[PDB]
Amino acid sequence: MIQPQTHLNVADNSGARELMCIRIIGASNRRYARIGDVIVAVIKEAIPNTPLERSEVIRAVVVRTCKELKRDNGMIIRYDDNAAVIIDQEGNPKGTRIFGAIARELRQKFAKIVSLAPEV
Amino acid sequence: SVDAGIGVMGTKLGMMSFFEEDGTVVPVTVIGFKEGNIVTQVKTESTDGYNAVQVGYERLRDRKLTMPERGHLNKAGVIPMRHLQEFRLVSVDDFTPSQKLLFEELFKEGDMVDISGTTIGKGFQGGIKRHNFKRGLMTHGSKSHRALGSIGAGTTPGHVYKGKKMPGRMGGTKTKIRKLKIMKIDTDLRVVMIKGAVPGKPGNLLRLAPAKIVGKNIPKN
Amino acid sequence: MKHGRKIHRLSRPADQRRALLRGLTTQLLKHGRIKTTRAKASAMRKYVDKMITLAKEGSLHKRRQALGFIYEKQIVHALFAEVPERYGDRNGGYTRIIRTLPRRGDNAPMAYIELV
Amino acid sequence: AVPKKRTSIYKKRIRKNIWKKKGYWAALKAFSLAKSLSTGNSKSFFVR
RNA sequence: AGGGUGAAAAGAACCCCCAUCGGGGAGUGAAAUAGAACAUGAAACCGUAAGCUCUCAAGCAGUGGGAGGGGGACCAGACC
RNA sequence: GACAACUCUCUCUAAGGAACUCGGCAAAAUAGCCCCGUAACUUCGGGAGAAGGGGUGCCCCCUCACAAAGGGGGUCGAAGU
RNA sequence: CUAUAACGGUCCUAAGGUAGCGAAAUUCCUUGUCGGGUAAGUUCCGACCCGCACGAAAGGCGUAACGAUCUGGGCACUGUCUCGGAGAGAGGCUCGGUGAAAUAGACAUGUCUGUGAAGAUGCGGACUACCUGCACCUGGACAGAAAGACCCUAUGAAGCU
RNA sequence: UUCACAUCGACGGGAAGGUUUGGCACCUCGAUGUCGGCUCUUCGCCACCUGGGGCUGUAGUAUGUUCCAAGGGUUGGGCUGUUCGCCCAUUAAAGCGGUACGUGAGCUGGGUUCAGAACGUCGUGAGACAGUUCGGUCCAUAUCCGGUGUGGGCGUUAGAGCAUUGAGAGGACCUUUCCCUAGUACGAGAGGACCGGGAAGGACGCACCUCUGGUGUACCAGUUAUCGUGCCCACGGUAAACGCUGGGUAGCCAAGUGCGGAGCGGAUAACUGCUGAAAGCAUCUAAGUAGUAAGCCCACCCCAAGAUGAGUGCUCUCCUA
RNA sequence: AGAGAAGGUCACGGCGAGACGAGCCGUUUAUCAUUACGAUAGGUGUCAAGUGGAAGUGCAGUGAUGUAUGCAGCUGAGGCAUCCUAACAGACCCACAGACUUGAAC
Ligand SMILES: [Mg+2]
Ligand SMILES: [Mg+2]
Ligand SMILES: [Mg+2]
Ligand SMILES: [Mg+2]
Ligand SMILES: [Mg+2]
Ligand SMILES: [Mg+2]
Ligand SMILES: [Mg+2]
Ligand SMILES: [Mg+2]
Ligand SMILES: [Mg+2]
Ligand SMILES: [Mg+2]
Ligand SMILES: [Mg+2]
Ligand SMILES: [Mg+2]
Ligand SMILES: [Mg+2]
Ligand SMILES: [Mg+2]
Ligand SMILES: [Mg+2]
Ligand SMILES: [Mg+2]
Ligand SMILES: [Mg+2]
Ligand SMILES: [Mg+2]
Ligand SMILES: [Mg+2]
Ligand SMILES: [Mg+2]
Ligand SMILES: [Mg+2]
Ligand SMILES: [Mg+2]
Ligand SMILES: [Mg+2]
Ligand SMILES: [Mg+2]
Ligand SMILES: [Mg+2]
Ligand SMILES: [Mg+2]
Ligand SMILES: [Mg+2]
Ligand SMILES: [Mg+2]
Ligand SMILES: [Mg+2]
Ligand SMILES: [Mg+2]
Ligand SMILES: [Mg+2]
Ligand SMILES: [Mg+2]
Ligand SMILES: [Mg+2]
Ligand SMILES: [Mg+2]
Ligand SMILES: [Mg+2]
Ligand SMILES: [Mg+2]
Ligand SMILES: [Mg+2]
Ligand SMILES: [Mg+2]
Ligand SMILES: [Mg+2]
Ligand SMILES: [Mg+2]
Ligand SMILES: [Mg+2]
Ligand SMILES: [Mg+2]
Ligand SMILES: [Mg+2]
Ligand SMILES: [Mg+2]
Ligand SMILES: [Mg+2]
Ligand SMILES: [Mg+2]
Ligand SMILES: [Mg+2]
Ligand SMILES: [Mg+2]
Ligand SMILES: [Mg+2]
Ligand SMILES: [Mg+2]
Ligand SMILES: [Mg+2]
Ligand SMILES: [Mg+2]
Ligand SMILES: [Mg+2]
Ligand SMILES: [Mg+2]
Ligand SMILES: [Mg+2]
Ligand SMILES: [Mg+2]
Ligand SMILES: [Mg+2]
Ligand SMILES: [Mg+2]
Ligand SMILES: [Mg+2]
Ligand SMILES: [Mg+2]
Ligand SMILES: [Mg+2]
Ligand SMILES: [Mg+2]
Ligand SMILES: [Mg+2]
Ligand SMILES: [Mg+2]
Ligand SMILES: [Mg+2]
Ligand SMILES: [Mg+2]
Ligand SMILES: [Mg+2]
Ligand SMILES: [Mg+2]
Ligand SMILES: [Mg+2]
Ligand SMILES: [Mg+2]
Ligand SMILES: [Mg+2]
Ligand SMILES: [Mg+2]
Ligand SMILES: [Mg+2]
Ligand SMILES: [Mg+2]
Ligand SMILES: [Mg+2]
Ligand SMILES: [Mg+2]
Ligand SMILES: [Mg+2]
Ligand SMILES: [Mg+2]
Ligand SMILES: [Mg+2]
Predict the structure, then answer these.
(1) CA–C1' B156–H96 (A)
(2) For residue C32, what are the CA distances in angstroms to B53, B214, C75, C112, C114?
(3) CA C94 from chain center: how many Å?
(4) CB distance from A75 to chain B under 8 Å?
(5) Which nucleotides of I are covered by protein (CB under 7 A)?
(6) Nearest Cα to A71, choosing from A38, A103, A117, A24?
(7) Which residues pair with B100 in a beta bridge?
(8) Strand E closer than 7 Å to the CB of D13?
(9) Residue A31 φ/ψ, nearest 5 degrees
(10) Which residues lie closer than 8 Å to B195 by C-beta, 6 or more apart?
(11) Chains that touch D (3 or more CB pairs under 8 A)
(12) What residue in C sits closest to B120 (Cα-Cα)?
């Protein structure tokens, strides 16, 4: 449930701290987004002396949402924050390491992120 | 209209879940069945100009029926019943009065079925709930919040268009939910389990018949 | 719409409902027969049967509830003295309603209510 | 708003008779109440 | 701004409805259908009864044709 | 009495948080007392309650109550001006 | 080297704008241009100067403090918004009692497309339409309300210079 | 490249349309309230995307130009009072216009058109500028028509209770990406298909509350201050229309849960054709006939005999003297 | 004229139906059982469910307080039983075998 002007955290080693979604990708003329959906984002806080600057436009995918993610077996997932991970056109992350747990639903689209995660 | 096959009538009892063997969850709706499901009348083209068959349901005390309705059921030696509905067909060569209609003989498993019943009556509702209109500003001095706004252009045409989406009664009418999958049968309790939602609250009447598809079952036109 | 809502509103807020019905039971249990409207009488059956249900189980915990509900103090002490002998066999339906002509001022449907 | 013109005489009467017509249904209820009360058999209505 | 019972108050004993107001008879008077909020009492307006008549319509409402029905001191192939 | 729309006066509202809008209009938030700590600039008076942080209930003791404040210990709750 | 003109010449005035400031509460061209801020800035800040038409007590440039002043940005906050939803109260709705008002040529008061003082319920043609109420919404009746307050006229009126 | 007409097309010519700026000043001065925006529609095509074709200087992918086609769709933001327009990120595309530059007895009032004040400029001056700037009251209980819904009466030829045909009417038939076919056809290579099939989404619509949660002034619990129940304990009232908070069943609701959009059915438009005269040839046709569009009609969903053209079928009733 | 046909309306008790009308259910609540029809609402009983461990008493502690009795206590708009109360009394409208013609039957 990621609307534009939504402040997201960063999970990877990309060297950023905060993001701000401005558009959604993949969903035609949609305004919200769940985990696994790609977004366009704007950096607002970055780490000093890193390849990423403060006001760059990038692509990223949502990995954590405070909104609840329903499964088929009745299980539901909930996080206590909103976060994302930057990506390239192929979909691989720039950061070498990942923080936070990832859901198993991302293996069908983003398997590299599932491997680098500490837990699932 | 022309139905693809023959259906029956039941009562909504509630709604629950259904765990599969693998573990997937299925929001399932339950439908019971009263005593009477017997045929009352058989219509033909020679008499009425069309082929169909009546079906009664919900047996009740005989005193409650009007005496004309008694003679209609007493012709075929049929018990008293409250409701009556038809099932139009192409051929009725294999039906007679005083004939029971077991649903398990007609709906085995995983068969698509068209449910139809009365919806929940909302009453005299506005435009935002009925026609999904948008709302005006709640601040910035706006006086109109949940109003319609304009209901026409002006001097041309000079009148309000017919069928203008406006307030009125909402719900309480007949609808039909198409292509619902049947999950399970239970002949011990005389009950049937269907995936998805059903119009109305528990105790409401409905009709369930085989799913009709345009080019497959019914005669095209 | 009020689908599934079982509550008597009586054209009064909650603070006045909780006081109006609470005050009429004080008068019925001492007089045994009063003259009120039909809407007030219909809402009264739920609460009068409650206080009478407390007397069957005439314990100390059940008495403190009636004292908080019933305004006056002497009726509650007198209520538990007579009900076990008076309603030692009845199970519910501790009152009836008798209709009556309406008033002259507002045509309000009036009716009596009494303890069987 | 404001009325453009005045209502006629007979269109007025047709609207008044409807208001008066409610008395027809109120009289039947009273007659039903009396005949259901002059027998002294109803135990649900105390008239005094 | 608000005038007019009647020749004369003789302004209505008494009885019924009746808590009053008010009304119905009685009695008064040429007249009470002049009864006091009272003299002659037009029109708009609100009504009751009787004769014909409208619920597939549409129209500045009438007019020229006039089906069917009704009506009356003159008469009637007339008239309303 | 009843408890439709719609209007007004009020309360809460998941995820997000000015994307609304001419404009953060309106609403929301802040709030007391005791400590700590308070910038550029300045007419040296101010700025200043700057900002920004911590504590706050009840019970026992220290304590002699010294009107206080403070310290120590214990305890209830999601939440102590 | 272009480009500018420290400098010089000439005409006309009583004299030809000195300090400081400057697309400004002043800049027509104009969203001037460069830079900063924003993912993106006709607004805002800084600077340049081509000052249409700044300028020294109708004062000029700055200025701490103050402002229910104008103006831009940010933190926090939130139903402002995405996108609405639920609930309480007073009205609305029903019954009984009391009981107005603006308005009003008479009104048996449909739509379309034509016609017409050029925008018709009222005329023409076709279509549609049983009669009569109640609760709701206001497109039209060039609706109501104020002998247009804008413009013009009067050998009108008044205030001011 | 040669080749007027794949695509542009000078020089000039002939038209339609009534959305631009204007000319005329015919209706309105005892009043026809404005620019833009919000909300809510509805039509037109001179077609931005989606469907189907022709030509190409069309290899393929992707275009270009043009025909049929208006069924549906045509985003969210930054600046501006704006329209227009520029920019950011997306999208199948982010179409042009009419309806008093649609819509103020439906809304807003930022702009313009009052009174205050100020800068610049003009004027000796009062004052003035289609120059700028700060500020600045938008009334209204629907009579009729019209419109959304819901009743009654009467009629439908004796009077009724149920079940129904469907003339007519509406709603909805929308769309993106990926995979397979296939790295195949094509092409030197780069690069990369038509047709057909199968999945996952978007938007919209009809329903639902088992699930996740909102609200929940029925209810439960915690707690501050004060009054009262003789006092302690324990309770109740008030702190508007919960004193403030923490949870909450049913109900309602969406963010939640299911379903939906089908047809090798009919007739056509553009186009391609078959057969084949006038015209011994040729010709898609002035006989006949076949393929084929998100379009048209039916089919799908709901209403429906006030359909006065008032229907159809089953059943029932019509007593006494 | 009498009397009240089918059936409808009011009235009585209610609703997951509803602005009011309308629409739907019910109006003495059965007896038999292999079986389904005669519980409308409220109350009562019981169960699901919600809140989360009542009062009183005892124990521990100087005390605040904790702890045991105790899935307690309260609630129970919902489900199922139960006629305990109220659906009592009853009232109104309503019954010409369906005019006239023609044909085919009889
Ligand atoms: Mg930047
Ligand atoms: Mg309802
Ligand atoms: Mg909106
Ligand atoms: Mg408001
Ligand atoms: Mg008109
Ligand atoms: Mg009231
Ligand atoms: Mg209170
Ligand atoms: Mg006289
Ligand atoms: Mg007189
Ligand atoms: Mg007709
Ligand atoms: Mg007629
Ligand atoms: Mg929120
Ligand atoms: Mg905006
Ligand atoms: Mg904005
Ligand atoms: Mg404010
Ligand atoms: Mg506030
Ligand atoms: Mg401070
Ligand atoms: Mg400061
Ligand atoms: Mg100088
Ligand atoms: Mg500028
Ligand atoms: Mg200037
Ligand atoms: Mg701005
Ligand atoms: Mg500047
Ligand atoms: Mg100056
Ligand atoms: Mg000087
Ligand atoms: Mg000077
Ligand atoms: Mg000055
Ligand atoms: Mg000020
Ligand atoms: Mg409300
Ligand atoms: Mg209310
Ligand atoms: Mg009244
Ligand atoms: Mg008419
Ligand atoms: Mg003309
Ligand atoms: Mg015209
Ligand atoms: Mg005429
Ligand atoms: Mg006409
Ligand atoms: Mg209105
Ligand atoms: Mg006017
Ligand atoms: Mg004038
Ligand atoms: Mg004038
Ligand atoms: Mg002159
Ligand atoms: Mg024009
Ligand atoms: Mg013009
Ligand atoms: Mg006028
Ligand atoms: Mg075209
Ligand atoms: Mg124009
Ligand atoms: Mg306009
Ligand atoms: Mg208007
Ligand atoms: Mg303004
Ligand atoms: Mg001067
Ligand atoms: Mg302002
Ligand atoms: Mg207004
Ligand atoms: Mg009206
Ligand atoms: Mg109407
Ligand atoms: Mg049809
Ligand atoms: Mg259709
Ligand atoms: Mg739920
Ligand atoms: Mg539930
Ligand atoms: Mg809930
Ligand atoms: Mg005391
Ligand atoms: Mg309390
Ligand atoms: Mg208290
Ligand atoms: Mg008090
Ligand atoms: Mg109060
Ligand atoms: Mg409050
Ligand atoms: Mg809650
Ligand atoms: Mg709460
Ligand atoms: Mg050929
Ligand atoms: Mg040939
Ligand atoms: Mg031919
Ligand atoms: Mg097609
Ligand atoms: Mg009868
Ligand atoms: Mg009825
Ligand atoms: Mg019961
Ligand atoms: Mg439990
Ligand atoms: Mg205890
Ligand atoms: Mg429990
Ligand atoms: Mg129970
Ligand atoms: Mg029993």
Answers:
(1) 22
(2) 62, 71, 12, 10, 6
(3) 10
(4) no
(5) 6-8, 10-19, 25-27, 36-38, 41-45, 54-56, 73-75, 77-78, 82, 84-92
(6) A103
(7) B38
(8) yes
(9) -110, -25
(10) B26, B27, B28, B29, B180, B181, B182, B183
(11) C
(12) C3
Backbone φ and ψ for C114, nearest 5 degrees, come out as -145, 160
Q: Residues followed by a break in chain C, C–N over 2.5 Å?
A: none
How far does CA B142 lie from the centroid of its chain?
43
Strand partners, A7: A20
What is the CATH number for A72? 2.40.150.20
Domain boundaries, chain B: 2-213
Tokens of B51: 């082929």
Distance B143 CA to ligand 37 centre (A): 12
Q: Identify residue D36 by its one-letter amino acid code.
A: S
| Experimental approach | cryo-EM
B147 touches strand F (CB under 7 A): yes
Tell me the structure's resolution in angstroms, rounded to a single decimal.
3.0
Fold observed for domain C1-116? 50s Ribosomal Protein L17; Chain: A, (3.90.1030)
Where does residue C2 rank: exposed (0-12), middle (13-18), buried (19+ CB within 10 A)? exposed
Each domain of chain C, given as residue ranges in start order, spans: 1-116
Q: How far is the CA of B23 from the C1' of I8 (A)?
A: 58
- Reported in sequence order, the residue ranges of chain B that DSSP labels E, i.e. its strands, are 8-16, 28-32, 39-43, 52-59, 81-86, 112-118, 123-125, 168-170, 174-186, 191-195, 205-210
Listed as ranges, the nucleotides of chain H within 7 A of a protein C-beta are: 38-42, 75-76, 88-94, 99-100, 102-109, 139-150, 160-166, 170-171, 175-176, 201-212, 217-219, 229-230, 234-243, 250-253, 255-265, 298-303, 312-317
Which DSSP string corresponds to B47-85?
TTSS-EEEEEEEE--GGGS-HHHHHHHHTTT---EEEEE
Give me the count of residues in chain A. 120
Rg (CA), chain D: 20
Please state the domain count of chain A: 1
Residue type, A29: N
